[PDB]
Design a protein around this nucleic acid. Structure first.
Lengths: 211, 247, 317, 317, 317
DNA sequence: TTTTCCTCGAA
RNA sequence: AUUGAAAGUUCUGUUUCGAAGAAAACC
């Protein structure tokens, strides 16, 4: 299991509207991150034959662990929801084992937009290394699943609904999965939370929790 | 109307002037004589002449203090009641106009509950060297001893009409003090507004004489006379004063 | 239309004043933007406003109108040009207020028959049916000429004393000297013609009869402004005025001469007039020039000597 | 298309006003962002709005159109440019409202045949089938030149009095001085050409016949703006205008010159025009320059002397 | 690919209105957080959206395509960029709908041959067998520079009145001024290339023939955006624009420069470009910079002067 | 440094 | 190539008409 950290300097912000009055998401779901990663390899195509349906060029990349967190202060606005955080910074962690270090680094240095077309995003730096599997008490910042037990004070918890990979095909809805974020609603920011994760990955001083 | 231009030769306040030369224009600081140092002499001569010829003179103006009727203390000293309202104002003026000649020819102002104004019938200006000091003066004798406030007729105007001739004669006589080494002098008597050329140029008597006839023709006037003194041509200012009194 | 530009030279002057501070009377001052060799600068210079000139012009017009038999309003017979703004003036003069927009025309004509001032000088009445009439003479501020890099102007304060035998008396007056320039415009083609749009109303024939007399009086009135009879504090601060340069243009089309800032503003306006007559399809363009300083004038332009000559010439045409 | 940039120097002016407070009349002001050696600053400076210029241009167009025989609408015959926005204007002029989208074209042509103003200046009708027509002349605010670190403009207030004999009368007016700049654009290739898409409708041949005259009048109308006949309060606050620098470009492709802020906006725009003709596959590019202040211009560009010359040259081509 | 970051300066501007309240038109604004020693502040700052820029770019592309002879669709000949999105548009244009997924590529090519805007601008068709295509140009919001301890952006409201002779007519408009910055991306390598997997279909030879001209037209369409021909309300509120800094990079691999927020974003993007080119095995990577606000640049960069030179250099490579 | 005023109207 | 792919809240309007800080005073 290898890992790669990437620092992103967003230009003006990002916005991913919810499925099904168009409120937005406070933080991008993992599916957007995986697609932004897959852009580096499948550039120039917008439809492929999966075998039975034309879903997307990012259906192949569906077993890569990816999380992200803020590093500055932004504001959510409904004026189609948006998150204004110009010149801000975002940290994204990619943990996987299905590809070598070279593939992951080359794909990671080739990220240009997260969300919709206007959400341009530069890449500042990446760091590639190995991660250690742990199960003891840890302190984490990145958003995790709902089932992760928490021991601290329930004072900085937000609840959102995201989708699985099944939403990569047109004319279909991704499966609903509840996630928990350690985020302050206004102004937007992120705070550390101590948990007792069953399976977490130390990736260089930040214990990323997954399940 | 009597409008005159006078040039003088005499052999400390300073003022700025804009001067013209061949290269263009310049700003200079030149000694001057104030415009109120000349009014005092004229008014003092008027007081002396009016007292000599039996004309009424105010109590305060009998002394050479020209506060006139500005303050309520002056009103108390002279002994005239203050005005009550706007309608009474005319009456007040007549009273003020029937005791002091200076308050008529030279104008006055009273400030208070019912302020009353009367602009001067003689207008003067600063004395600037052309040292060859020059100046100009203007008088409108057609309004001497004539009430200026608008209102109904009041008792006592008959005395004003009787004394109008002597008042105008005294006002004309009073110019001798200001006119008195004279070099060039121009006097013009008209029935229309007119302003003679200043004494800034060597050739100005000809210009104003030429303009006089054209102005009379264009203004539908009926009287225009000019008098010139250089040292019609006369010799002494006394003859000019006598001619002005006669005509 | 009769347009013109005039250059003046005035010394030891205070014709326009403003609110006093302590025992000091302040002369009006204003900021001006000037172009030097080094760039653009802002300066504070004494000026003379444009409403003293209008007052003097209207006073002379009242005098001439009463002299030659034209009607003059009641309040404006006194030198108080409130005209017809308030209801008290209407009550004094004896004119009913307009009822609706349709009646508006009538009102103007009635007013237009009682005072020449309300005709030549324009007026305004505000109410249920507001009625406006723009002045037929347009004037501007009296600014010193913005020539070269140094403004030819100066301002100072002077100290005066009242004398008394029982002290228990001191004041200060501001005095200025400048090379004043100003331009003016008068469209005689619209004098004694109603400006409100509507239907003909009885009483306009008498209006047409007096049109020549009204135009003649309005033209004659400009002698006051061109001669220098305006302003205040003339009893003891009589200015030493003088004329230096003057240009008057008579045209059938809109036109404005060059302001008297640059030393060459007669040649430029003559050339612009010659071209503008052709470009605008005009049929009349005449120029009169008075030059007493010795600057370049041009060719094919009448040269006069005084102001009465110009008044006569303007009357004749 | 004909584009241009113009620089004026104005003193002791109040041409556009805004809502008054007490006895004070306020001049229009706006914020600008200016770059200084220390960084970027925000300032508040006097401005002149961009709609008074349109009113002046349209009034001159009405005058010339009536003078030379072109049709002019009923309400626009008086200087009230409501055009055809409301139903009352249509009722007065005598035009039926459009029924559906397909009839829309017809409506425009009818409106396009009665008033030159509704053609050159564009118009809007809102209703069941809204009809839009963009103005063929484009104008903007008049702003002081943002040159260097100090803005060369100033604004102050002045004190004025009305005279009466029975006191029972005081007002204040804002007066400004500035170095104004503004740019304009006019596309004559679309004058007398319908803008709404549809089928040919009877009455367009007459439109084609008058195209040259309409273009001639539209080009002629710019003389007022380029000479300085606009704004308000001209009767007693007549400004002292002056033209310093002007550049006009005639091309067959979209193009816009540099704003007149920096001292070098003529050389830059001439170079840009020379390159832009090549880049866009153009076939015509001409430039006219008037320079009275003495700044760098360039080479191979016509140098004029006045504005009437520019009007004639624009008419010829 | 070609990417760019651009820094503009705009004064007395309104190019993006929003839902009017009463008789007032409001600007589009966004919230930002400014950190202070005392704490934090939430400011509301003007922005310009990115859809207006897309509309301006597509209009310029329409003009250039119709001028150079490229095919343009029936509807897109008019400035109604609905594109072939609904059944009615297809019926108007005359293209059969795709039958199944396998024919999808075929359909695209047909569309890709009838219209140029549908290729560069991208289209989407919703129906039984959806066919999608992403735009080849991407543009971001125009938001001012959050540089330093201040936000150089101000916004006010102004008062306008329509004048009439029968009063029974007042509106307000917000005007902004700011230091705007935006970035853009354009992948000319994918122009005229189908965007679906499948066997080659007849008609792609015509696309191969037309590819060079289509790429040239798409590059030429950038001149309008970089010159300032976007927005709205340009007839009466024509803005003033100026260019301060611009960095455009031409590469062979995905890359985008730093946002133009920090006062030093030219050095950082050069360093990042060097690292990315080293790590991604790139062969060509060039940078063009236009510098007018005097910021630090570095070494290894081509220095231009205007935007026409940039467009020429982009066309050559 | 004393007196007087210190905006009206219609959108 | 990412609930992603396609979208100008756009056109039309003067803050205008009018009004003297004026009267009196010795360095």
């Amino acid at each position: 299991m290898i890992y790669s950290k990437v620092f992103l300097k967003l230009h003006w912000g990002f916005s991913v509207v919810k499925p099904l009055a168009k409120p937005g998401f406070y933080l991008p779901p993992p599916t957007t991150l995986i697609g932004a990663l897959s852009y580096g390899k499948f550039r120039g195509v917008d439809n492929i034959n999966l075998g039975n349906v034309y879903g997307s060029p990012a259906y192949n990349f569906r077993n890569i662990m990816a999380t992200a967190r803020l590093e500055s202060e932004g504001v959510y606005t409904e004026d189609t929801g948006k998150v204004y955080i110009p010149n801000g910074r975002l940290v994204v962690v990619y943990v996987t084992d299905s590809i070598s270090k070279e593939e992951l680094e080359k794909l990671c240095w080739s990220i240009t937009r997260i969300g919709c077309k206007e959400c341009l995003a530069s890449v500042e730096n990446v760091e590639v290394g190995e991660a250690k599997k742990v199960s003891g008490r840890v302190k984490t910042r990145y958003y995790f699943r709902d089932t992760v037990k928490v021991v601290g004070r329930k004072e900085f918890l937000e609840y959102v609904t995201f989708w699985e990979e099944n939403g990569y095909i047109w004319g279909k809805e991704g499966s609903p999965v509840r996630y928990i974020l350690p985020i302050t609603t206004y102004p937007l920011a992120s705070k550390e939370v101590e948990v007792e994760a069953k399976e977490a990955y130390e990736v260089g001083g930040e214990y990323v929790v997954f399940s | 109307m009597i409008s005159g231009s006078v040039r003088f030769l005499v052999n400390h306040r300073t003022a700025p002037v804009v001067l013209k030369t061949s290269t263009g224009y310049l700003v200079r600081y030149v000694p001057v004589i104030s415009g109120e140092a000349l009014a005092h002499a004229y008014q003092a001569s008027l007081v002396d002449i009016a007292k000599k010829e039996g004309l009424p003179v105010g109590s305060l103006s009998s002394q050479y203090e020209f506060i006139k009727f500005s303050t309520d203390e002056a009103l108390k000293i002279e002994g005239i009641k203050e005005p009550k309202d706007y309608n009474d104002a005319r009456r007040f003026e007549v009273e003020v106009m029937l005791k002091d000649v200076i308050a008529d020819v030279g104008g006055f102002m009273y400030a208070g509950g019912a302020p009353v104004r009367r602009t001067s019938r003689i207008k003067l200006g600063y004395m600037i060297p052309a040292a060859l000091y020059t100046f100009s003066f203007e008088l409108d004798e057609d309004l001497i001893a004539v009430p200026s406030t608008f209102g109904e007729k009041v008792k006592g105007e008959e005395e004003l009409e009787r004394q109008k001739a002597k008042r105008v004669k005294s006002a004309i006589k009073a110019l001798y003090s200001l006119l008195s080494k004279l070099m060039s002098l121009v006097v013009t008597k008209t029935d229309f507004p007119f302003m003679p050329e200043p004494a800034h140029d060597d050739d100005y008597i000809k210009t104003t004489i030429m303009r006089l006839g054209k102005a009379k023709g264009v203004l539908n006037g009926n009287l225009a006379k000019a008098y010139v003194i250089n040292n019609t041509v006369l010799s002494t200012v006394e003859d000019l004063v006598v001619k002005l009194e006669e005509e | 239309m009769i347009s013109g530009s005039v250059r003046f030279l005035v010394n030891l002057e205070s014709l326009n004043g403003v609110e006093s501070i302590g025992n000091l009377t302040k002369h009006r001052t204003a900021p001006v933007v000037l172009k030097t060799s080094t760039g653009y600068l802002v300066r504070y210079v004494p000026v003379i406003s444009g409403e003293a000139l209008a007052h003097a012009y209207q006073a002379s017009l009242v005098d001439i109108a009463k002299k030659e038999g034209l009607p003059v309003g009641s309040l404006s017979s006194q030198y108080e040009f409130i005209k017809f703004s308030t209801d008290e003036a209407l009550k004094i003069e004896g004119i009913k207020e307009p009822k609706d927009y349709n009646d508006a025309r009538r009102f103007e004509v009635e007013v237009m028959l009682k005072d020449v001032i309300a005709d030549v000088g324009g007026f305004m009445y505000a109410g249920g049916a507001p009625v406006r009439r723009t002045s037929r003479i347009k004037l501007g501020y009296m600014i010193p000429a913005l020539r070269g890099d140094e403004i030819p102007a100066q301002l100072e304060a002077q100290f005066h004393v009242r004398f008394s035998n029982k002290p228990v008396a001191i004041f200060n007056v501001e005095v200025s000297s400048a090379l004043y320039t100003f331009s003016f415009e008068l469209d005689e083609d619209l004098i004694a013609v109603p400006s409100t749009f509507g239907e003909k109303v009885k009483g306009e024939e008498e209006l047409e009869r007096q049109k020549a007399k009204r135009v003649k009086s309005a033209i004659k009135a400009l002698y006051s402004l061109l001669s220098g009879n305006f302003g205040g504090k003339r009893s003891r601060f009589l200015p030493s005025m003088k004329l230096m340069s003057l240009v008057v243009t008579k045209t059938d089309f809109p036109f404005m001469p060059e302001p008297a800032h640059d030393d060459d503003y007669i040649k430029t306006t003559i050339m612009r007039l010659g071209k503008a007559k052709g470009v605008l399809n005009g049929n009349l363009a005449k120029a009169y020039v008075i030059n007493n300083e010795g600057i370049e004038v041009g060719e094919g332009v009448t040269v006069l000597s005084t102001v009465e000559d110009l008044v006569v010439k303007l009357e004749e045409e």
